[PDB]
């Protein structure tokens, strides 16, 4: 799950 605009799923992105 990588999102860019999501602060959620950012936490648990690292593109993102």
């Given at each position: 799950?990588?999102?860019c605009?999501?602060k959620?799923?950012?936490?648990?992105s690292?593109?993102c």
């Amino acid at each position: 799950c990588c999102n860019c605009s999501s602060k959620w799923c950012r936490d648990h992105s690292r593109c993102c």
